[PDB]
Amino acid sequence: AVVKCKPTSPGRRHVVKVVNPELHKGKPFAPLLEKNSKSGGRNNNGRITTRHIGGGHKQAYRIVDFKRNKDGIPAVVERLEYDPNRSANIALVLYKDGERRYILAPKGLKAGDQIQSGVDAAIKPGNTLPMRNIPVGSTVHNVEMKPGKGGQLARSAGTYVQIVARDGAYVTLRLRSGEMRKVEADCRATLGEVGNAEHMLRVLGKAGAARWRGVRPTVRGTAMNPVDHPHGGGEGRNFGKHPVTPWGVQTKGKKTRSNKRTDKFIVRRRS
Amino acid sequence: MIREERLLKVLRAPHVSEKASTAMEKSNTIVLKVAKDATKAEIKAAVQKLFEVEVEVVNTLVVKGKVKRHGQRIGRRSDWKKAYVTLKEGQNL
Amino acid sequence: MKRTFQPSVLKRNRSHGFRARMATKNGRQVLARRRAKGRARLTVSK
RNA sequence: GCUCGCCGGAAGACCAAGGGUUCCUGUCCAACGUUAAUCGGGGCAGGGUGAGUCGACCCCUAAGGCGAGGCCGAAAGGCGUAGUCGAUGGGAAACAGGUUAAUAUUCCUGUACUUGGUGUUACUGCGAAGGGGGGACGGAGAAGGCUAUGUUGGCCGGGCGACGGUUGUCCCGGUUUAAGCGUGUAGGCUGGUUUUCCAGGCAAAUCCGGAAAAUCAAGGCUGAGGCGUGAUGACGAGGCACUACGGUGCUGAAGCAACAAAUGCCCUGCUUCCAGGAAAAGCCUCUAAGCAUCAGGUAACAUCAAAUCGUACCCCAAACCGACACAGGUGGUCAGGUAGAGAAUACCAAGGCGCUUGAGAGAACUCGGGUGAAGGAACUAGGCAAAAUGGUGCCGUAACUUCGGGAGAAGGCACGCUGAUAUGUAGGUGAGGUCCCUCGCGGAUGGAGCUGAAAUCAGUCGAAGAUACCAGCUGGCUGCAACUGUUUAUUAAAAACACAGCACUGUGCAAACACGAAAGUGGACGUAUACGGUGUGACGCCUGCCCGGUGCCGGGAGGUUAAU
RNA sequence: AGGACCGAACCGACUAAUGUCGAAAAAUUAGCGGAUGACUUGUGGCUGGGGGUGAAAGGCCAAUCAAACCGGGAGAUAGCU
């Protein structure tokens, strides 16, 4: 999907277009369209919680059937669709019932592929079941954390997990980042990787992109005046301090993690 | 069945003016002063019993009184209702 | 130079409306303060 | 009243929003108005503002607010659930003309149409806080067709020219008509249609979904435009009669064809692009409960209604905003004729205006302008300004390099007008006739006419023909920073900021964190190709040491020491 | 195709000149930058003081912001006029 575009513009110079020539030009499937709101960082109180957030083009919704719990009833994909709500891409399948749904994509996932879910699922990618019956070692993705939560794992571009160990009732799993964690074998997950992994090839060179990719500028902290930020001061470009949170807590490295609700699942921390 | 009680009340007055006469002649359209409620159909039936005649249909309206001052103190007339009230044919009184 | 005041009767209401004040406590805590002083006009919606 | 001047993508007309009587009549000149006032948004009085259809209201939501329950919380109360309202949005339909001093799509005329209700009729499965569909949506381009619109002719009707000519390639005006209706087009999309069956659409489906099988290639749907009706009507120059010297009344001819062609419509089209592009009602289907004899619905007829509230007027502004009748600001709608690439530039059209003191006088000094001998920047902090250039088409045109640019590099050419080529050519347009076909608003046809470059050549005036306006100076060396961007509403616009990638770091979800007295927020409807923070800034070459200090990550052996 | 160019409107405020009791509590004149996009402007809505938001200047917050306005404490206090 890689093409360097030609430097016709001061400003078109380092662009990187990311073109799937197979992405369906056209409008999404109505049965998955849902109204969305641009938070811009605000809260219920309205105060802007997360910063540099706001703007960004109008952007529809595709409720992901993360659960995919439909067993014994098979489906065939019809279209891989691009969603700005992800970095991955979404694939409409047609269950033998006739009910329809997008799904996220294994790499080799293309039009014309027939799958389903369930403990007796085929082992061709895209199908999914829990890793009590998923064979060990296999490289997988789209993973649950608790039974029936829906799935909050490997959800992303070229994401996938390879089994390191299966602990009786349990399984440790290699996150694409490098922590290994016990998860119940009945927690379901999807076989294979994710396609589309080239996102990182995109460089969003124009300010316009992140602008219309919904990014406020982010200050060079110390550049601002002491008046508010931890970093600050400098009669010209001076730090002489510690890098800390914009509320004062050191950065450039502080172990801050304390969940402890689940740490017993932290088998080996990520590096 | 608009009750004559409220009915007889509703009407305020007949008015006189050039345009009034002019509707009178060109159209046989009566020209009145009537209440704040003074809904069209109200007026219709009202004048209809009050002259024993055959209303066609009316136009409603709202005047805005002038805010004149009365010596030094300022005032403004409470507003009222005229109406363009005609019949296919009728005898004016 | 487009100066301070801009008009909207709608915005007058939704700004300091009779319903506005009377809906909130603090609002409910002004009508007196003026009735206390005895303003001719309660608020600006007349 | 006359002559003069001025504007006119507005200093015109119509609106929202605001204004909330100023508009017009009559009347007076205290004060108000910056002079005078006979005039008035000034004083006083009267008047006028008409909606089944134009808005509002209304039906629905939209981001939002509020909030029964509840949860959280000292009390305030936070918050959200059910809900529930909240347009800049969506949803039934009107127009032409006439009409007054003062409104008007509401009044008169005429022609519409739309939404309920009521009944009468025959047909009779309908019905829903619920199913589905539809409403329904982005950007960029690009035509083509049409049309308003505009041009010429034909037409009519007027007239014959204040001084050379001016009975005709003469001159002046005009050369009109709505909605809807019926047409159904250029066009755009669309496979139809039948039968069966099915873990799907929260029950249920006859519907949407699907599966199959069939089975035929048509239909459907959309959609300007144009045509007939409209509209033998009215309008419509003018004429005539009367006068309130302001308008009345009647007549009212012609009122067609062709050209040119929208930033408008077909267009929610098409085709492409990634930045991936409201919702729900109105509408259509559906059945649950229920009743389906009733009801309800189908439709034909008939009938009725279609509340109110708004409605004048003002508006790029004397009425809005800024204390003034304000050289400041305020969105939307329309958009002529002349050259012109042209929503401009100039100058007129309809229109409208001539900016509320005037008049003389013509020293300085100003303030804007124009004008200039030689010199040509020596002036000045600084070539600030000014000047100086500028267009079109062609030829030709560096350094350097991210190969694009630069590069309107530079530099030069040439330009009016008439004639001919060629009494308008290229081109465009397309008449008639001729035909062809399932007959149409069909097609090939042929070119009638008409519109219409550009070039060449001829000839020729000037001093000059990019003739006015309009309309970059350019060079070369570099510091800076890659720039498009942002910025000090009001003394500063860059190197300051941001920024694209890059690295660091932190973090595997009840995530980090931020607000939050906590609920619970956003993150993120995301799950590390993700986000946070920091640093830094494209890109190419690269990015060393000092871990002492100070922070941070880890290690614990011992000293260390609270609370108990 | 372009955060393309020239340049209308539109938005902006770079240079000078008036003008600084001015017509305006920031203008206009001469110019001038952007001019399909980080475009721009309505209408609606949201954000709150040691708070908000800020492409950061300590900006900007009803002309007024190194801590808004307004009420109160409070007739704050003043080895100082």
GROMACS .gro file of N, CA, C and O (backbone and C1' of nucleotides) in nm, chain D residues 335-362:
model
  196
  745A        P    1  -2.972   3.699  -0.994
  745A      O5'    2  -2.981   3.798  -1.117
  745A      C5'    3  -2.863   3.841  -1.183
  745A      C4'    4  -2.818   3.973  -1.129
  745A      C3'    5  -2.673   4.011  -1.155
  745A      O3'    6  -2.661   4.071  -1.283
  745A      C1'    7  -2.735   4.058  -0.929
  746G        P    8  -2.528   4.147  -1.334
  746G      O5'    9  -2.572   4.198  -1.477
  746G      C5'   10  -2.673   4.129  -1.549
  746G      C4'   11  -2.763   4.223  -1.623
  746G      C3'   12  -2.695   4.309  -1.728
  746G      O3'   13  -2.684   4.241  -1.853
  746G      C1'   14  -2.821   4.447  -1.587
  747G        P   15  -2.605   4.307  -1.976
  747G      O5'   16  -2.699   4.427  -2.020
  747G      C5'   17  -2.705   4.467  -2.154
  747G      C4'   18  -2.621   4.589  -2.177
  747G      C3'   19  -2.472   4.567  -2.179
  747G      O3'   20  -2.424   4.508  -2.298
  747G      C1'   21  -2.520   4.756  -2.051
  748U        P   22  -2.275   4.450  -2.297
  748U      O5'   23  -2.186   4.578  -2.319
  748U      C5'   24  -2.211   4.662  -2.429
  748U      C4'   25  -2.136   4.790  -2.411
  748U      C3'   26  -1.990   4.772  -2.378
  748U      O3'   27  -1.913   4.736  -2.490
  748U      C1'   28  -2.082   4.930  -2.232
  749A        P   29  -1.886   4.580  -2.519
  749A      O5'   30  -1.729   4.566  -2.500
  749A      C5'   31  -1.642   4.647  -2.578
  749A      C4'   32  -1.518   4.687  -2.503
  749A      C3'   33  -1.430   4.577  -2.447
  749A      O3'   34  -1.357   4.505  -2.545
  749A      C1'   35  -1.450   4.745  -2.286
  750G        P   36  -1.373   4.345  -2.553
  750G      O5'   37  -1.315   4.292  -2.414
  750G      C5'   38  -1.183   4.323  -2.373
  750G      C4'   39  -1.179   4.365  -2.229
  750G      C3'   40  -1.152   4.256  -2.127
  750G      O3'   41  -1.015   4.225  -2.114
  750G      C1'   42  -1.337   4.386  -2.057
  751A        P   43  -0.963   4.078  -2.152
  751A      O5'   44  -1.085   3.983  -2.117
  751A      C5'   45  -1.098   3.857  -2.179
  751A      C4'   46  -1.126   3.751  -2.077
  751A      C3'   47  -1.212   3.795  -1.960
  751A      O3'   48  -1.351   3.785  -1.988
  751A      C1'   49  -1.021   3.681  -1.880
  752G        P   50  -1.444   3.916  -1.989
  752G      O5'   51  -1.507   3.920  -1.843
  752G      C5'   52  -1.558   3.803  -1.783
  752G      C4'   53  -1.529   3.803  -1.636
  752G      C3'   54  -1.572   3.929  -1.563
  752G      O3'   55  -1.705   3.914  -1.516
  752G      C1'   56  -1.348   3.870  -1.504
  753A        P   57  -1.784   4.035  -1.447
  753A      O5'   58  -1.735   4.032  -1.295
  753A      C5'   59  -1.802   3.951  -1.199
  753A      C4'   60  -1.827   4.026  -1.070
  753A      C3'   61  -1.704   4.049  -0.984
  753A      O3'   62  -1.722   4.168  -0.908
  753A      C1'   63  -1.857   3.916  -0.866
  754A        P   64  -1.756   4.305  -0.983
  754A      O5'   65  -1.684   4.416  -0.896
  754A      C5'   66  -1.601   4.380  -0.788
  754A      C4'   67  -1.456   4.382  -0.827
  754A      C3'   68  -1.401   4.513  -0.881
  754A      O3'   69  -1.370   4.603  -0.776
  754A      C1'   70  -1.313   4.325  -1.001
  755U        P   71  -1.339   4.758  -0.806
  755U      O5'   72  -1.251   4.757  -0.937
  755U      C5'   73  -1.110   4.772  -0.929
  755U      C4'   74  -1.062   4.835  -1.056
  755U      C3'   75  -1.155   4.940  -1.113
  755U      O3'   76  -1.140   5.067  -1.051
  755U      C1'   77  -1.098   4.789  -1.283
  756A        P   78  -1.270   5.154  -1.018
  756A      O5'   79  -1.304   5.226  -1.156
  756A      C5'   80  -1.206   5.304  -1.223
  756A      C4'   81  -1.245   5.330  -1.366
  756A      C3'   82  -1.379   5.398  -1.385
  756A      O3'   83  -1.363   5.538  -1.388
  756A      C1'   84  -1.353   5.214  -1.536
  757C        P   85  -1.486   5.632  -1.347
  757C      O5'   86  -1.599   5.592  -1.450
  757C      C5'   87  -1.605   5.655  -1.576
  757C      C4'   88  -1.733   5.617  -1.643
  757C      C3'   89  -1.858   5.643  -1.561
  757C      O3'   90  -1.905   5.774  -1.585
  757C      C1'   91  -1.865   5.429  -1.671
  758C        P   92  -2.043   5.829  -1.523
  758C      O5'   93  -2.155   5.754  -1.607
  758C      C5'   94  -2.288   5.736  -1.559
  758C      C4'   95  -2.365   5.650  -1.655
  758C      C3'   96  -2.497   5.590  -1.608
  758C      O3'   97  -2.606   5.680  -1.623
  758C      C1'   98  -2.368   5.425  -1.719
  759A        P   99  -2.748   5.649  -1.555
  759A      O5'  100  -2.791   5.505  -1.607
  759A      C5'  101  -2.859   5.490  -1.730
  759A      C4'  102  -2.921   5.353  -1.742
  759A      C3'  103  -3.025   5.320  -1.638
  759A      O3'  104  -3.149   5.381  -1.666
  759A      C1'  105  -2.881   5.136  -1.665
  760A        P  106  -3.203   5.495  -1.569
  760A      O5'  107  -3.308   5.418  -1.478
  760A      C5'  108  -3.410   5.340  -1.538
  760A      C4'  109  -3.459   5.234  -1.444
  760A      C3'  110  -3.473   5.277  -1.300
  760A      O3'  111  -3.594   5.346  -1.275
  760A      C1'  112  -3.352   5.078  -1.307
  761G        P  113  -3.587   5.498  -1.227
  761G      O5'  114  -3.544   5.486  -1.074
  761G      C5'  115  -3.602   5.387  -0.992
  761G      C4'  116  -3.506   5.345  -0.884
  761G      C3'  117  -3.441   5.459  -0.809
  761G      O3'  118  -3.525   5.510  -0.708
  761G      C1'  119  -3.277   5.303  -0.872
  762G        P  120  -3.532   5.667  -0.682
  762G      O5'  121  -3.491   5.678  -0.530
  762G      C5'  122  -3.428   5.568  -0.468
  762G      C4'  123  -3.284   5.599  -0.439
  762G      C3'  124  -3.248   5.746  -0.441
  762G      O3'  125  -3.295   5.812  -0.326
  762G      C1'  126  -3.080   5.621  -0.550
  763C        P  127  -3.218   5.938  -0.264
  763C      O5'  128  -3.095   5.874  -0.190
  763C      C5'  129  -3.015   5.953  -0.107
  763C      C4'  130  -2.893   6.000  -0.179
  763C      C3'  131  -2.879   6.149  -0.199
  763C      O3'  132  -2.842   6.214  -0.080
  763C      C1'  133  -2.797   6.028  -0.387
  764G        P  134  -2.852   6.373  -0.069
  764G      O5'  135  -2.715   6.415  -0.001
  764G      C5'  136  -2.593   6.369  -0.054
  764G      C4'  137  -2.542   6.461  -0.161
  764G      C3'  138  -2.598   6.602  -0.161
  764G      O3'  139  -2.532   6.685  -0.067
  764G      C1'  140  -2.571   6.518  -0.383
  765C        P  141  -2.592   6.714   0.080
  765C      O5'  142  -2.526   6.600   0.169
  765C      C5'  143  -2.588   6.554   0.291
  765C      C4'  144  -2.510   6.438   0.348
  765C      C3'  145  -2.402   6.475   0.448
  765C      O3'  146  -2.456   6.483   0.580
  765C      C1'  147  -2.316   6.321   0.290
  766U        P  148  -2.432   6.614   0.667
  766U      O5'  149  -2.571   6.689   0.658
  766U      C5'  150  -2.588   6.806   0.574
  766U      C4'  151  -2.571   6.932   0.656
  766U      C3'  152  -2.526   6.913   0.800
  766U      O3'  153  -2.446   7.022   0.842
  766U      C1'  154  -2.759   6.970   0.788
  767U        P  155  -2.288   7.015   0.825
  767U      O5'  156  -2.246   7.169   0.827
  767U      C5'  157  -2.254   7.246   0.706
  767U      C4'  158  -2.365   7.349   0.716
  767U      C3'  159  -2.351   7.467   0.620
  767U      O3'  160  -2.412   7.445   0.493
  767U      C1'  161  -2.374   7.548   0.840
  768G        P  162  -2.337   7.357   0.379
  768G      O5'  163  -2.358   7.441   0.246
  768G      C5'  164  -2.267   7.543   0.211
  768G      C4'  165  -2.316   7.677   0.255
  768G      C3'  166  -2.236   7.798   0.208
  768G      O3'  167  -2.263   7.833   0.074
  768G      C1'  168  -2.292   7.822   0.436
  769A        P  169  -2.165   7.783  -0.042
  769A      O5'  170  -2.087   7.914  -0.085
  769A      C5'  171  -2.157   8.022  -0.142
  769A      C4'  172  -2.137   8.146  -0.061
  769A      C3'  173  -2.005   8.218  -0.082
  769A      O3'  174  -2.011   8.306  -0.191
  769A      C1'  175  -2.061   8.207   0.149
  770G        P  176  -1.933   8.273  -0.330
  770G      O5'  177  -1.780   8.299  -0.294
  770G      C5'  178  -1.713   8.414  -0.348
  770G      C4'  179  -1.686   8.512  -0.237
  770G      C3'  180  -1.539   8.548  -0.219
  770G      O3'  181  -1.511   8.666  -0.293
  770G      C1'  182  -1.643   8.501  -0.008
  771A        P  183  -1.404   8.661  -0.410
  771A      O5'  184  -1.265   8.663  -0.332
  771A      C5'  185  -1.212   8.785  -0.278
  771A      C4'  186  -1.124   8.754  -0.160
  771A      C3'  187  -1.001   8.669  -0.192
  771A      O3'  188  -0.891   8.756  -0.217
  771A      C1'  189  -1.113   8.588   0.003
  772G        P  190  -0.831   8.775  -0.365
  772G      O5'  191  -0.718   8.664  -0.372
  772G      C5'  192  -0.611   8.668  -0.279
  772G      C4'  193  -0.571   8.531  -0.231
  772G      C3'  194  -0.478   8.450  -0.322
  772G      O3'  195  -0.377   8.387  -0.244
  772G      C1'  196  -0.666   8.321  -0.262
   0.00000   0.00000   0.00000
